[PDB]
Ligand binder design. Structure first.
Ligand code: HEM
Ligand code: HEM
Ligand SMILES: CN(C)C(=N)NC(=N)N
Ligand SMILES: CN(C)C(=N)NC(=N)N
Lengths: 452, 452
């Protein structure tokens, strides 16, 4: 789509260069670029990912219309992002009707009822984490969060997905661990992804040469492994629903996409939270005290005891305001429409700048401050769920939201129950976000760990 | 080739943007861009046509080494420019050995001896031009130069190439005229050519889909027509040489490339010259008087009488200084080399900025002034043939140089012998060069024509 579009609609934005559009402006990252735009164009604005017109919108009403109201009719899909092969059938990648059919099939698989049943199995890998954390903190050495939580994230993933019970930290050898480690989030600012943003006409070329964003060796192993398992957790609940019709290949797709969506995310948010606890020892203390008041003398966490903890919730939700790892929510516009008096022409990408809104003065007091109290029950009724969107909104939000909260909360409970986390000379203060396309820390967070 | 190259060699130039390199700087045209660079970087400099490193060089010595000395060993070829199909065999497109073989075969076809024989046949279409010029100036109407000279250029081309004698102006119907009209110079700043400069990886794709810069319908007509002619001028002289071996397809290639190279060029320089004569009526007069002193009372021009005319030559050569329609000379570097102490790495494009040098103060007094006197025999020994290069230099210069001068000179003699050319209200004063990639006037030159 040519570069006249936003002039002809009369929408402000940075003047695009030929071929590139505004990509060079990503040298700061999606996160800063989005702020600067909000700051200087106001409430609504447009830019070009190559030839692709992207309309940022920041009106809570409009957001709700896009994310909630017209989701089924107009704004159903995310923007295509690269050669995906069979993963076109993964719920997060799938489109229109085929997506609605898959969302319906998998919805009951993420019931609180089912979650409740998985708690005992997630709980088990708190004990494991604790154990691994004991040894390596008892050494006196500064721990690397990403590897500690990564190993935990996958421990909870392999076990809740495939029933395969492993100690990821003490089994790097295991074939099943080697592969799921490579299932990382894509950095859409790296050279591969920038290129196909500027050469989208290359996606079909790549499709045909069998090249795929989901590495073939990993996808092969997991399909051929689900092949065996099926011959004799999430796998099961899916097997059990066999429009309607979850098919064979559709099932492996989901299995894989649940790993993709949950692994580096969970472990990534967990890191950010421990960083905030270590740099705010008062918040750390207050939580450690709430946990003891509910689970006295290292009592094991449970579904209900987890949902009892206001301060925990406050800390988790406050960390997500600052570090909304999705950064943006997007939908592609299926047809010409008028939303809250605004004309959106077919093919444009509607983008909601979650990270920017999460840090907008209009909604937030001292937005840069880690301040769990914003989420206290007697002072959160003024938080707009269309401004605060770490899991998106509407029929296409994070299907694994409640699973990811519970899982994280179980990590933190066991970890804080046994330990305290502290600053160091390598600990970067304050934290500085990476310049690429993932919301991660520039240098992976290292902290000191002690036995309580 | 990445954008580190000229930093790592320590050569100055404009900082390239990613993917584009310096192409946006072409919004002024090759002509201004080259000046500004010379003006601000000095004698030698580098820029990037997309990912393609281009080394401009302006030292007469270096130029001579590139264009003359190392031509056969290092700098033999021009830069590839697009899908060419069978025209890869045209002498101007052909490479290395295959080029040297074709240059050798066609050299004797451009002897002054052969030229001499074609004079009577070119001469004939002076009479024709005159005739067409009589009528349409006798109307009192302002004449369009490009159509007057275009029609003449092709009249001289069809007849010296294929023996086909036509009145192009009064035969637009003729199949043979319809096609050769479309054989225009390529504008390497237009969208097609800019794209394949930034997507050179697209040339092979285009080759395979049979798409070609030389339009297929025109190339088809000329091949199938040379097909017949051969069954029963330049065609003949080529037929007669049937390494060695001019082949069938190689022959049609040349036939076509001679049309391509001579048609819009000749007519384009001719326009520029009449513009200068009309805006400098003294120079016009002085020439009209030289012509009469050699060819008294409209006597018909001949080879020797044409070569007698110092002032004519002076006017033709002076107009070419200002309007060197090639603009640049280029060679691709076959291997790493050191030329006059300068390291040129393999694959770089050596570019000589003819138009810029033609207007460099260091060599030229009041460079913007149309001043035929710079070329007078008693004041031209200080003109460096490596600064003044309207036909390039060395073994790969314009093979049709002497033909094009003679042909032009025969146009001008007959035209000035019968007429005078004058300014008008539509005549742009002074002339402003186009912003694209051909050195042509922005608005096609219109002048008034009278009977002497
Ligand atoms: C803290 C961890 C997590 C965060 C912050 C997170 C956030 C998000 C966000 C922002 C979206 C996009 C929603 C939208 O477009 O409006 C999303 C989609 C999704 N998430 Fe998560 N997520 C996390 C963990 C998980 C986990 C554990 C799963 C487990 C299966 C999961 C599965 C998905 C799926 C399948 C989608 C796509 C839904 C669809 O297209 O219908 N996520 N997530
Ligand atoms: C005023 C008219 C003309 C001008 C200014 C002109 C100028 C040039 C220039 C600058 C080159 C490039 C030389 C180099 O790379 O160093 C060239 C090449 C060439 N010209 Fe012309 N030319 C004109 C008319 C003609 C005519 C009538 C022919 C007739 C056949 C012709 C045939 C060629 C050919 C074949 C080449 C390529 C030579 C090779 O690659 O070996 N030109 N011309
Ligand atoms: C969870 N997945 C796979 C996404 N759709 N990506 C995202 N925006 N979080
Ligand atoms: C005559 N031809 C075809 C060229 N090589 N182009 C040019 N630079 N004048």
């Amino acid at each position: 789509h040519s570069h006249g579009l936003f002039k002809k609609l009369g929408i402000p934005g940075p003047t695009p260069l030929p071929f590139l559009g505004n990509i060079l402006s990503y040298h700061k990252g999606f996160c800063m670029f989005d702020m600067e735009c909000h700051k200087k164009y106001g409430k609504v604005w447009g830019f070009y990912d190559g030839q692709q017109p992207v309309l940022a919108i920041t009106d809570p009403d409009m957001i709700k219309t896009v994310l909630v109201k017209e989701c089924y009719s107009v704004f159903t899909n995310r923007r295509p992002f690269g050669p995906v092969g069979f993963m076109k059938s993964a719920i997060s990648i799938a489109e229109d009707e085929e997506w609605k059919r898959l969302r319906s099939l998998l919805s009951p698989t993420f019931t609180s009822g089912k979650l409740k049943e998985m708690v005992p199995i997630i709980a088990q890998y708190g004990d494991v984490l604790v154990r691994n954390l004991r040894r390596e903190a008892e050494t006196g050495k500064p721990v690397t969060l990403k590897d500690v939580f990564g190993a935990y994230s996958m421990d909870v993933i392999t076990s809740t997905s495939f029933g395969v019970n492993i100690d990821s930290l003490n089994n790097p050898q295991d074939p099943f661990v080697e592969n799921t480690k490579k299932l990382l989030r894509f950095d859409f600012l790296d050279p591969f992804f920038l290129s196909i943003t500027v050469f989208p006409f290359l996606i079909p070329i790549l499709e045909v040469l069998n090249i795929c964003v989901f590495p073939r060796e990993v996808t092969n192993f997991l399909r051929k492994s689900v092949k065996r398992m099926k011959e004799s957790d999430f796998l099961q609940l899916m097997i059990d629903s066999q429009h309607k019709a979850l098919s064979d290949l559709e099932l492996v797709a989901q299995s894989i996409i649940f790993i993709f969506a949950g692994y580096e995310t969970t472990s990534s948010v967990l890191s950010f939270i421990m960083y905030e606890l270590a740099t705010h020892p008062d918040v750390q203390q207050k939580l450690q005290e709430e946990i003891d008041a509910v689970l006295p003398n290292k009592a094991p966490p449970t579904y209900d005891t987890v949902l009892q903890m206001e301060y925990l919730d406050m800390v988790v939700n406050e960390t997500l305001r600052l570090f909304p790892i999705a950064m943006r929510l997007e939908r592609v516009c299926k047809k010409d429409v008028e939303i809250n008096g605004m004309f959106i022409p077919k093919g444009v990408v509607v983008m909601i700048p979650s990270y920017a809104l999460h840090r907008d003065p209009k909604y937030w007091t001292e937005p840069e401050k880690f301040l769990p109290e914003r989420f206290s029950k007697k002072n959160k009724d003024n938080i707009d769920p269309y401004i605060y969107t770490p899991f998106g909104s509407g029929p296409r939000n994070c299907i694994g939201m409640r699973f990811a909260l519970m899982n994280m909360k179980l990590a933190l409970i066991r970890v804080l129950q046994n330990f305290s986390f502290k600053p160091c000379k390598e600990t970067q203060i304050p934290l500085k976000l990476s310049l690429g396309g993932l919301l991660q820390p520039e240098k992976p967070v290292v902290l000191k760990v002690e036995s309580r």
